[PDB]
């Protein structure tokens, strides 16, 4: 009972600190996204695709991050209302307590390596080529109102821009050839009530049309090959990666410790840099791995610092 | 089986809060820790419990060192903690709340637990209320429903904190039962409580600890005849 | 009333500037974190430390605002955990005159804000951008009816390969007028070798017209205009407006410092305002959680609306001092139900 | 100056807490606001001070209406409040903890608030430290110095809560030595109190509040000698 008891609040704890972490995350991405396609460096329609496919790059992150703020929220709160020391009082230790969710954590380690795997290999893929697609934009699609654009051989002027990138006001063209319109309307492009001049050719007219990764590869072709340090980083990140749930139950069981008085949210600000230094190491380690500076086994080596740690800081 | 407690010692901002505190509990003896307060008996009380580590001394039971041992693994040799806030499982069930501690036991299979359940609400008067969460009952309730819980644990020994606490005269004479209750069925009682003349109305043995020592001990007749008591602690006029 | 008085204005900007410094060296850290990872043989790792602490100036005036909300949460939390603000009330003590108080050290906050932004931000952006990466090449400009290219332009007042071309209300060209190099002597007008001009043929080895470009304004076009300081961002905006359009990413700018001040008072009332509020009788970490909650929301908020006024049709004012007016309002009622 | 409280009524999560609570006041006259725990003690006392926003009711002082006033207004009027917890300023000495109440008061100039604050630490015997942190006090020391911090305000109802809470009984004569020169001093005192014992001792009118009403008014030994009161709160035994 009352392992059921711990595993529902921290699965309600720990889904709810996901959905404020990946709503946070992820706005700040999306905020993000918008001021550049508010530029016309992106098409405002598929900034939300972006999102879609960076949804498990983000949750990478957000489940070892949400699942460590939702344990130590969990043994806080059993800390500041007395549960613990009646928990204590009768024989279940905080390790033991922290041993009856280890299945929890084994859920959320599967959980997180289908993430690390499947699924942030494929975002990633998609990701990237829809960016790839998203960066051929030149000319009349990044075009500003009351500015001057430079894309390659081509100057562009637009003195105002609609809600949506259509609908141009007042251009300017240079190439030489210069194109003076009141209108455009979108390169495939309808200019009207113009005048086109070449550098002396003057032409009127009414109408005119102008028409000027490693970290997304399938696991399937990084299993071997781990002799080049790019693979071998890679695949050691994907493997090694999903321990970080069996780390942060081990850390959010040290470190959870609070007063009453404190509060159930005193210790979550000093321990999620703790945590912040793992994932931050573990960056590190992926960086100079790729470089064959450090080698694979720096994963493990790293994991299994933090946890003894993590272990004898609760042991003591 | 006695608790023998010898010269606890505790310092919080180089001062010495309690200064060589030692005191004896039996089982089935109800033993009230008193004091001026803020003068050690709280920190000692807790460093009975476990609460807070010791600095000096040892804790024994029956040539057996509680000293180095966890506030757990005391509770694995017979001794039981209540809090004096409220201390239910919030979010389970009353009953549930006394079957997550009879789980814990190694002794007893489901069909010893669930009868050692119902027994436990039975006579806590609970059974009416058993399916009802811990966060949406009455204090007096509540608090049957922890002491029940407590002794699903089969503790030897109990260290109430502050029993007589936000309780008014109605409720403190079933407080009193309960305690009488707690001392007949074979479990010592340790009590540390503000309310005084509430205290020394049933424990038969109070230690009173006055600027971090013990300075008297005895039956509640003594300490109220002591002099010592009366003029740091109960004062002149006291009954 | 002074004990009072100094007591919460002291015990809030101690607050404020604790959260500061935190802060201040937080965020060295997390960007020379970042920063790490862009290191070559020209740019050592002392080099990106002297990147990311050139730049320590830059990141204070984006924290002081936040830095104001958590400082005012912990001043004010401190004080209302300690039944200190009860106590307050109850000798005869207005929330109000508690927030005029609190705001008494904001107000210092605004005033480092000030002098950061005008005065330390642009030396030391200059600086930092001088050791990372260590004049307008291409300026592309529009005066009116003329449109002025030059390939080469210094700050000293030297000009290569100006190309002008000229126009009607009905857009007609008269003149396409090219040189090879420009001296800058007085206002309106610029002195030029080969000048070739077109009729509408003709050479000219040297003669000066009128042209608006001034060589004070043209190191100014490729800083981007939310890093110019309030002075430069007046001037320059002036300058534009005198011979051309401003562009709206120049308005969002002048709107977002102009209501940086306010933005700063208006959250650190909202802190007073959940601390005497909603705020209340909670933890410290649970107040502290709020208010980065708070701080990220507003940054997210401000950030989206200055994006969606480079989009939409009305002015960035409705977008910068919309949710300062909003959040001062939603605080003043929270201060009213006490 | 009588403090006529009427039909105070609160609800919290759709339950009526408090439901008709009225009682009245004089000044310098000890009331006992007693009760149940959780039966609308703790919240018409709060209430009255001013934390607890009212949903219905009147409060009269001299006929002038303090119900829709807020707590801070009231304390203008003559209201005083003393937490039960430490509401000592930390980061401020004992001297000028009662100073920065001092200065608020508006007939008093720079010459004549000196005596007071002379006067105010001589008759609560907190002299000695008033150069002292009010952070680093011993705990009656400290409870001197708050209620002489809030005599500084010159109120004319002092509502103490939970005077008696943590307190030896050697040192309840010295609560009640305070409270009796409260009074004498022309001050009106309410007391809410889960030590009844004590608190029915000093008051000389009690009311009793069960169920969110007022079940019992007058004396002590009309409170005692109330079959309502002796059934529902006291007990048989007292
Ligand atoms: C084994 C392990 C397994 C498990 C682990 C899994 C693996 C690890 C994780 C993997 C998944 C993540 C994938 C990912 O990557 O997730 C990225 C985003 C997350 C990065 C995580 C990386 C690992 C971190 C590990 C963390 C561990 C915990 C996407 C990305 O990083 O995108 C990258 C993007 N990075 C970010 O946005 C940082 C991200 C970093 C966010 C980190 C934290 C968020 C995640 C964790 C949340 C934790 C909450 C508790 O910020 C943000 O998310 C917005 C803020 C979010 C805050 C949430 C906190 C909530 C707290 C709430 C209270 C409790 C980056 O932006 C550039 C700059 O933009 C702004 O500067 P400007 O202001 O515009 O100048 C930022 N400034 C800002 O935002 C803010 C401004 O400074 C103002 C700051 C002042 C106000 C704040 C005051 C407080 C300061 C002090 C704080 C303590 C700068 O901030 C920086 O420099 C760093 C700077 O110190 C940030 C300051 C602090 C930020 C807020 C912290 C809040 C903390 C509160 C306290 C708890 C930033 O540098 O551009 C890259 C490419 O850049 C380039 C290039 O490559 O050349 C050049 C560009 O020019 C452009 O061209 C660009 C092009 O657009 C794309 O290429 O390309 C993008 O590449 P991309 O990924 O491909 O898109």
Redesign the pocket.
């Given at each position: 009972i009352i392992r059921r008891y711990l595993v529902k609040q921290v699965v309600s704890t720990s889904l709810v600190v996901i959905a404020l972490?990946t709503l946070?995350?992820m706005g700040?991405?999306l905020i993000?996204y918008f001021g550049?396609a508010a530029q016309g460096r992106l098409d405002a329609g598929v900034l939300f695709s972006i999102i879609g496919y960076?949804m498990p790059?983000?949750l990478?992150?957000?489940?070892?991050?949400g699942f460590f703020?939702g344990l130590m929220l969990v043994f806080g709160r059993l800390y500041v209302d007395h549960e613990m020391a009646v928990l204590n009082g009768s024989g279940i230790s905080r390790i033991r307590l922290g041993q009856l969710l280890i299945p929890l954590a084994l859920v959320f380690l599967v959980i997180?390596g289908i993430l690390?795997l499947w699924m942030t290999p494929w975002g990633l893929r998609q990701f990237d080529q829809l960016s790839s697609s998203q960066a051929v934009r030149t000319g009349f699609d990044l075009v500003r109102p009351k500015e001057f654009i430079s894309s390659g051989p081509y100057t562009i002027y637009a003195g105002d821009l609609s809600e949506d990138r259509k609908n141009l006001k007042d251009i300017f063209f240079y190439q030489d050839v210069m194109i003076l319109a009141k209108e455009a309307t979108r390169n495939v492009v309808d200019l009207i009530q113009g005048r086109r001049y070449e550098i002396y050719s003057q032409a009127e007219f009414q109408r005119y049309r102008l028409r000027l990764k490693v970290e997304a590869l399938p696991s399937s072709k990084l299993w071997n090959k781990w002799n080049d340090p790019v693979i071998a980083s890679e695949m050691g990140?994907r493997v090694?990666?999903?321990f970080?749930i069996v780390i942060a139950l081990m850390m959010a069981v040290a470190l959870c410790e609070v007063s009453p008085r404190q509060g159930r949210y005193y210790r979550?600000?000093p321990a999620?840099?703790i945590?912040?230094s793992?994932?931050?190491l573990?960056?590190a380690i992926?960086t100079r791995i790729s470089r064959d500076e450090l080698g694979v086994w720096a994963?493990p080596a790293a994991l299994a610092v933090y946890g003894i740690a993590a272990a004898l800081f609760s042991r003591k | 089986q006695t608790l023998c407690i010898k010269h606890l010692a505790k310092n919080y901002s180089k001062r010495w809060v309690v200064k060589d505190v030692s005191f004896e509990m039996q089982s089935g003896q109800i033993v009230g820790l008193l004091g001026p307060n803020g003068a050690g008996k709280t920190t000692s009380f807790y460093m009975v419990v476990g609460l807070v580590r010791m600095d000096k001394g040892e804790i024994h039971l029956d040539n057996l060192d509680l000293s180095d041992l966890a506030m757990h693994e005391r509770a694995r040799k017979g001794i039981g903690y209540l809090p004096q806030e409220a201390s239910i499982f919030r979010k389970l069930t009353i009953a549930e709340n006394i079957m997550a501690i009879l789980e814990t036991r190694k002794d007893l299979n489901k069909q010893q637990r669930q009868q050692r359940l119902q027994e436990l609400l039975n006579d806590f008067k609970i059974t009416h209320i058993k399916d009802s969460l811990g966060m949406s009952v009455s204090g007096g309730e509540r608090r049957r429903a922890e002491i029940a819980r407590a002794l699903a644990a089969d503790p030897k020994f109990m260290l109430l904190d502050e029993p007589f606490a936000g309780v008014d005269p109605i409720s403190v004479g079933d407080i009193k039962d309960i305690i009488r209750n707690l001392k007949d069925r074979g479990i010592g009682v340790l009590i540390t409580d503000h309310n005084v003349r509430e205290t020394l109305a049933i424990c038969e043995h109070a230690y009173i600890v006055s600027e971090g020592a013990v300075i008297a001990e005895g039956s509640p007749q003594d300490i109220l005849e002591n002099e010592q008591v009366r003029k740091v602690y109960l004062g002149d006029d006291f009954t | 009333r002074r004990i009072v008085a100094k007591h919460v204005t002291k015990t809030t900007a101690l607050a404020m500037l604790g959260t500061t410094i935190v802060?201040?060296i937080?965020?060295v850290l997390?960007?020379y974190?970042?920063?790490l990872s862009n290191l070559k043989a020209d740019y050592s790792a002392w080099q990106a430390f002297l990147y990311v602490l050139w730049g320590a100036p830059r990141?204070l005036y984006?924290?002081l605002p936040?830095?104001a909300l958590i400082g005012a949460i912990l001043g004010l939390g401190t004080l209302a955990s300690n039944s200190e603000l009860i106590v307050m009330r109850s000798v005869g003590i207005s929330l109000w005159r508690i927030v005029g108080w609190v705001i008494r050290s904001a107000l210092v906050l605004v005033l480092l804000s000030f002098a950061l932004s005008e005065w330390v931000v642009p030396y030391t952006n200059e600086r930092a951008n001088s050791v990372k990466s260590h004049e307008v090449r291409g300026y592309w400009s529009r005066e009116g009816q003329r449109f002025i290219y030059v390939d080469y332009a210094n700050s000293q007042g030297q000009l290569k390969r100006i190309q002008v071309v000229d126009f009607d209300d009905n857009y007609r060209l008269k003149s396409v007028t090219n040189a090879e190099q420009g001296q800058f002597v007085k206002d309106g007008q610029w002195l030029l070798n080969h000048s070739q001009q077109m009729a509408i043929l003709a050479n000219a080895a040297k003669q000066p017209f009128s042209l608006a470009l001034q060589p004070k304004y043209v190191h100014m076009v490729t800083i981007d205009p939310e890093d110019l300081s309030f002075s430069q961002l007046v001037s320059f905006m002036n300058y534009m407006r005198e011979y051309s359009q401003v562009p709206k990413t120049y308005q969002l700018a002048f709107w977002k410092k102009v209501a940086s001040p306010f933005a700063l008072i208006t959250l650190v009332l909202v802190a007073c305002s959940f601390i005497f509020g909603p705020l209340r009788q909670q933890s410290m970490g649970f107040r502290l959680?709020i208010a980065?909650?708070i701080?990220?929301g507003f940054?997210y908020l401000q950030d989206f609306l200055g994006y969606a006024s480079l989009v939409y049709n009305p002015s960035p004012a409705w977008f910068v001092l919309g949710p300062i007016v909003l959040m001062f309002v939603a605080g003043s009622y929270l201060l009213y139900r006490a």
């Open positions: 972490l946070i995350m700040g991405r993000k550049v960076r790059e983000f990478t992150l957000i489940l070892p991050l703020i997180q690390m990140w090694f990666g999903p970080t979550l600000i999620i840099f945590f912040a793992l994932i931050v573990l960056i992926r994963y | - | 802060l201040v937080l965020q997390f960007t974190l970042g920063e990141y984006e924290i936040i830095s959680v980065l909650f701080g990220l940054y």
